DNA sequence: GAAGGGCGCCTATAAAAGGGGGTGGGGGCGTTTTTTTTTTTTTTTTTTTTCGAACACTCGAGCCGAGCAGACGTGCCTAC
């Protein structure tokens, strides 16, 4: 939990993983950008996963 | 000290009354009907409540005025007012009323030129005041001054700013 | 206080007791004698390297026990006593323990079983019910109510107040003996209606409040 | 005393008028305290496999810098 959330991948992606509602905090207050570039963002998104 | 009270409320109304002449003990024990409290009380009276009396108005011989001391003028207290710094003094109607004469003979040609009453010792309670300068705009006013309120809502030296741009 | 003085006579004259365990059973059967003279007699046969003690009981108030010493080197005691003359006194010293065994064995039993049937027996739950329904035995007017109503059926509802003057007396009266009072005293004090006792004390008082709406009114000492 | 009988008050209705009283309706003070020393108990304390670190915080400790003081060195005044 803790080392996956180092990763530089998007918010949305750690969201899907344990940490839920406290790295969309620290996402939000940042201000970071998701690209949807990877597999569960887009899915969860419902357009077609690359 | 309850009866020493009756002297206190009979003197009270002599002084509502309208008259403060003085009077001897024995008459006053006498009109409080209290001539039988004894010696021992009486003694009492003589060297505690007429001596030791803070505010007791020996004069004739005789002890008078005994529920008022700080006030004797009996008029708007115009000296008290003309003050810039000191000026003042919200006073109790029932005050007022008690020190001479009752306010509301006086008050109705008064509530258009010298006094002005407003609800404060209590909603029923009324305190005595005083105006000066015009209002500013004939309007309905209370809804246009209900739109004015300004904004005691931030950002104000910038709305300023932006007003003046 | 010399009533806290332990008289030291008994053990200064190294006076010695015994002391021995006997059963409630056998001291109540000591019980019917009532000091009347004796419960029994102690027998004490001594042999060449054994000592056998016992008690007999009386024929008469029977109408063998042996006993057994125990040791005591390991302590020391004593007995003092407390009179119903508030003294204390050093009485004596005990000098053996000892405890009484029965002769009688499995038998004794159903008598201690009959004595168990003695301490233990208060009817548990026991006999149940049949009946059912008695409650409710109709008051119609509430049998405490009633005699509530009836301590009111005498002169109560109506009050002085009126009397102004002699109700001032006792305002009066009542304020030379405090400087301020609760106003549910006063109510006990002058038996009249509370808002006209209200009006009076605006008229020759004031208020002065604490706490959780906790108010006394006073005259104004001065 | 136990029991049955006879006498008398009880509730409803009415309807009014003065005054005491009650159940409110609402607001207040948010107490402090009197103690009863409490239902706020130990859930399960654990039956444990317990962390699983990460992060914050604690408290102490040691190197390093400035100032101070004496020893070493220099600067200044007096006598032949």
Redesign the interface.
Known sequence: RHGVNRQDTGPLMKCSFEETVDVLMEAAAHGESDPMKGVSENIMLGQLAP | FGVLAKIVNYMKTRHQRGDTHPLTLDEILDETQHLDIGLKQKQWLMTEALVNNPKIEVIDGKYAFKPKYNVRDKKALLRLLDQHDQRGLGGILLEDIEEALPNSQKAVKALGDQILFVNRPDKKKILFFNDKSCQFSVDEEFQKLWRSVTVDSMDEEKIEEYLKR | AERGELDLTGAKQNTGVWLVKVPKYLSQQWAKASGRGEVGKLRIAKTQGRTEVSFTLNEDLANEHPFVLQSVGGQTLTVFTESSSDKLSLEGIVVQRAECRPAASENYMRLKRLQIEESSKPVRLSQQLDKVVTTNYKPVANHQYNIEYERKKKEDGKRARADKQHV?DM??????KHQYYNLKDLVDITKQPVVYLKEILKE?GVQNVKGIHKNTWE????
């Open positions: 001032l305002l009066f009266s009542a304020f030379e020759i005259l104004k000492p001065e």
